[PDB]
Amino acid sequence: EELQVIQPDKSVSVAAGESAILHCTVTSLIPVGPIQWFRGAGPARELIYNQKEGHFPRVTTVSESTKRENMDFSISISNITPADAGTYYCVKFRKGSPDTEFKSGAGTELSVRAKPSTRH
């Protein structure tokens, strides 16, 4: 029954300027600890969202609450540009001193479609 982190989309394609929804659910509430979203798998990955701390004005959670019982950690990111293309990972932390990474999701690759030129 060990926790799994489920990212059901391998890939998401959005038009430039549209919002992009990156899905993540968990199969257990055990162990307690934060779910964080990153762009990149690497040491220079960017923290995209953490509900417990920090400011992320582009992100809106699907779950619409911080209830401890929530199992959907999916987010929407507004006004997508090619700078946002990347593989996004939903990561389960175990609370501790310090919190440690328990499970990472498989990644969802965000691609961004350029607006066709006019007219013609």
**Contact residues: its own copies, CB under 8 A:** 1, 6, 8, 21, 23, 25, 27-28, 62-67, 69-72, 74, 76
Distances (CA, A) of 48 to 54, 57, 75, 120: 10, 10, 10, 38
CB of 37 vs its own copies, minimal distance in Å: 15
Nearer to its own copies, 31 or 40 (CB): 31
**DSSP 3-state assignment of 100?**
strand
Asked whether 110 and 84 are in contact (CB, 8 A), the reply is: yes
Reduce the DSSP state of residue 93 to 3 states and report it. Answer: strand
Q: Which of 90/91 has CB closer to its own copies?
A: 90
Rank residues 12 and 85 by Cβ distance to its own copies and give the closer one: 12
**Three-state helix/strand/coil letters over 12-55:** EEEECCCCEEECCEECCCCCCCCEEEEECCCCCCEEEEECCCCC
Least distance between its own copies and beta carbon 22 (Å): 11
Cα–Cα distance for residue pair 85/87, rounded to 1 Å = 7
Judged by CB, which is closer to its own copies: 46, or 109?
A: 109
